[model samples]
Target: MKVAVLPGDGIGPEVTEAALKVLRALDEAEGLGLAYEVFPFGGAAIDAFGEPFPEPTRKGVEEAEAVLLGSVGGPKWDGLPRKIRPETGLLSLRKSQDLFANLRPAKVFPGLERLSPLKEEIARGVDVLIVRELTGGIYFGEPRGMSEAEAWNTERYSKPEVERVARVAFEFARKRRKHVVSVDKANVLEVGEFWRKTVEEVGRGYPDVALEHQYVDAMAMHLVRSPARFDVVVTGNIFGDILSDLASVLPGSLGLLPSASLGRGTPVFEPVHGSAPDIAGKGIANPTAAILSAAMMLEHAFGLVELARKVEDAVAKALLETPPPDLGGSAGTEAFTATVLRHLA
Candidate 1:
């Protein structure tokens, strides 16, 4: 498969460098025929082309089947024009690609229960996939504006939009625990009511996969109180955005989670963490998320489930055998990656 690699900025380059090593090892070992081309993106793109997403980068991304992103945006570009900012580039990339569904899995790795704020019993075995509707809803709703006194943003969702994201949720549920929790505020918002009904309409098509609904506020409480109860939690853009970030805390650190955004365009897999500019050259940033993102790309983008599993298993083993500094161990980014590579070998 052809892959577009965007090692965005800061620690993004270091982490992506480690991820590519594991990927190259897998490609060589399994003959996966993976082809990769690096592109200047985010802050780097701004420096190189005066914009975060240049024409050449867009063309390259369009040609690739999948995109492996590290992290984007750092303090360095905070003062630049908003249109040329790295974050704006991310929005444009997703908008141009029409990437709507975001899948963020929050699973507590073994032997890392202490890292979680929740009790060990509540945190352990807590594996939940947050399927967030990315493109639509308030994030892109019309008639949104912020004035000096009053600020307003519309939360909207069409039946077709809800249906597409719901289907992605059920499809993913079939691969896991076969349970889908469609979260919304049906008791209040009209858009939430429509979302509930639409998700229900789509759920009927997947009879084997059970479906349930929860209000956003209640879901928020339940996420912290009993996170393990959920298998696949799907919701609209705003809710999903909040809930995914909320769920990310269950695993203790953002450095350990990976996310995939998919739709009618090239899929992009990236770590849920950000570009830690302060630690850009420290070699202490965790590469686990980036490597696991590569595993996600292998499975979701290439249908190489076995290869993906092998990579995931190696990550788990490496973490247990040689915990990274973020997890209170001595190994640096390269050392941790070497441990994973050794396990892969």
Candidate 2:
């Protein structure tokens, strides 16, 4: 499959380099046939051209089947023009690519549940996929801005917008535990009420999957208290964005989680963690998330489930012993990446 590699900023480039090693190893050994088109994005793009997302990245990734992006921001470009800010650039890329469904799965790795704050028993077997409605809702809602007196951002979702993401959630649940927890604040916001109603309408199409509703605040508590009760969660932009980050705690470190955002065309895969400015250039940032993101690219973008499983198994095997430093092990980025590569070998 054609892939776009956007090595972003801070430790973003560092971890992406390590991930490419794993991909190269797989390509050489197993013929995964991943042809990469590299692009500069985030802070690097701004630094090089005063644009966080230059035209080259747009032109390249627009045609790719999948794009793997490293974390994208740092203090370096914090005061830039809003239109060219690293974050704004990221949002543009997602919208331009039409990536509307953001999937983030939180599951505990064997022998690594101790990293989780939850009791091992509570954390164990906790597999939940948060299917977020990206590219819409408050993040992209109409008439949004902050004023000197009051700030305003619309929370809106059209029927079709709600239905598409609802379908994505049900399809995932069909492969999972056959349950979908649609989260919203129907009692309050009109958009939330619309969200719940539209998702229910979509639920009828999937008669086999159990569809349930929960208020966002209550669902937040339930996720931390008893996450295993949920197999899939479908929600709006702000809610899903918050909940997915909340799920990061299930696996202990943000460095171990990966996310995929899909839409009409090419999907974008990225690690849930950030650039970690404190660890930039230290050769200690964890590459696990980036590597696992490659696995998601393989499965979702190329129909390479077996290859994806092999990559996931390598990650799982490496976690059995000394893990990356973020996971409380002494191994630095390269050492941990070499460990995963060894398993692949």
Candidate 3:
């Protein structure tokens, strides 16, 4: 399998390096015929080529069957123009790839429920799949502009945009809990009402997957108070962005969550956590999320479901036996990765 590796910025390289080590080991053992090419992207690309998403990197991702991304953006690029910012590159890349559905699965590891900030019982057995609509909504909406006094951005979504992502959510729910709660602000925003209507129409096609609706405000509170009550949550881009981050924390640390963005082109698997610039080069950043992302790539991109589960099981076992500093343990990044590799063996 050919993969495009985008180790963006800050601790991105560190975590990606750890993930690749495990992938190489798996490649040898499983004979998966994996090959990858690293491309300059995000802030790193801006520094090297004066553009966050250079032509070479774009071409690389376009040709690869799958993409593995670490994370992007840091304080170093905060002064750059909005167009060339690392985040802009990410948005552009998603649009270029037509990546319209972002799947962020947040769950508490079997033996690590105590690490969650929420009370153990509240956090235990929490499994949520957030199907976020990408490439649309406020993030990409038109009539957006900034000024010295006031700035405004439009919030919009077409019928097809909402329907496609809603289908993804129900499909996932059918395989898991078969329950979907479509979250929106329909009580107020017109766009939210539209989203609710669109998702409801989509749900009609899947009677086996029970569907429900929750205002974003209530869903946010429910996630913290009764997380296990949720199965699949489908939402717009902005709401999904915030809600996914909120759900991610229930798993103890952001370092434990993985995400996959899929569409017409190559799929991109990445850690939900951003570049922890504060911990860059400290050798203490958790690689579990990145490693798990690689697992997602294994399953979604190559259809190696068994191998993907092996990687996930290794991560869970390693977390129980030897978690990294993020989880209040002593093992540094390399040590944690080694422990995971041991478990994989």
Candidate 4:
């Protein structure tokens, strides 16, 4: 299998290095003859080649079997025009790949339950998978951003857009704890009302899957209060952005969560956190999320379940044995990666 690696900017390279170290170890242990080709895109490319995401980078990603990205954006290029901003590169990449379903699993690990702001009892055993509608919503909708003074954006969704992501969520629910919660602000926004109606219509196709609805506000409250109550939570891009970050804290730091973006054919995997310009090249960034992302790529994209499990086991064992400095432990990037690699044996 061929994997495209984009170590974007700032701490992107730091954490990606650690992930690759662990992934290489897993490759050796599982005898998975996987080859990876690294590409530079996003802010780094803009800095070097004068374009945030060059056509060459886009071409490389489109041809690869799967793509893995580190964090993007930093202070250096923050002054650039909105059209050339780092986030624009990400949006362009996702749109180019036609990545539609974004799966973010928020589950508190064993030893790190106390790290959550929620009480231990409430946070324990909290496992929820958020299926976010990635391509549509305000992120890609027309009439976005500002031309001069008045700023405006759109949240538009068609029937097919809602049905496609809802089916993925329902299928995910069938595999998991058999409960699907569709969160939207149906009472307020017209698009939200459409979202609700479409999800309900999609639910009719899956009778075995129990369905629930919550306004975005109430869902946010329940997410922090008792996240364990949810099995699979699905939402649009804006709401999912807010909810996923809220749900991510249940596990620990934003650095601990791995996210997968699926398109029609190849999928892209990356951590949820952005590149920390302040800590760039400091060698202190935590790599667990990126490493876990690699594990997700192995299982979800490559169909290498045993290799994926080993990578995950190594991450869990490493976190238990040698927590990183970000998580209040002494191990830096290399040390943490070495510990995880050692466990792959």
Per-candidate TM equals 0.97, 0.93, 0.92, 0.91
All models: lDDT?
0.92, 0.88, 0.91, 0.87
RMSD for all candidates, in order, please: 1.2, 1.9, 2.2, 2.4
* Lowest lDDT 10-residue stretch of candidate 1: 322-331
> What is the alpha-carbon lDDT for the whole of candidate 3?
0.91
Per-residue CA lDDT of model 4 for 295-333, tens digit only, reads 888887887777788878778888889998878899889
- In model 1, the clashing pairs are none
Residue pair clashes in candidate 3: none
Residues 190-247 of candidate 2: C-alpha lDDT, one tens digit per residue: 9888888999898999999999999999999999999978899999989998999898
lDDT, model 1: 0.92
Alpha-carbon runs more than 4 Å astray in model 3: 142-153
lDDT of 1 by residue, 1-345 (tens): 899999999999999998999999988997989899999999999998999999999998999999999889988899997989999999988988899999999999878888899999999989999999988888889998987999998888888899999999999999889999999999989998999999999988999999999999999999999998899999999999999999999988888999999998999999988998998999999999999999999999999888899889899999888888888888899999999999898
Q: Rank by lDDT, descending? A: 1, 3, 2, 4
Question: On a 0 to 1 TM-score scale, where does candidate 1 land against the true structure?
Answer: 0.97
**Candidate 2 lDDT trough over 10 residues, lowest sum:** 319-328
- TM-score: which candidate is best? 1
List pairs with backbone clashes in candidate 2.
none
User: Which has the greatest lDDT?
Assistant: 1
Instruction: List ranges where model 4 is wrong by over 4 Å.
Output: 138-154, 187-190
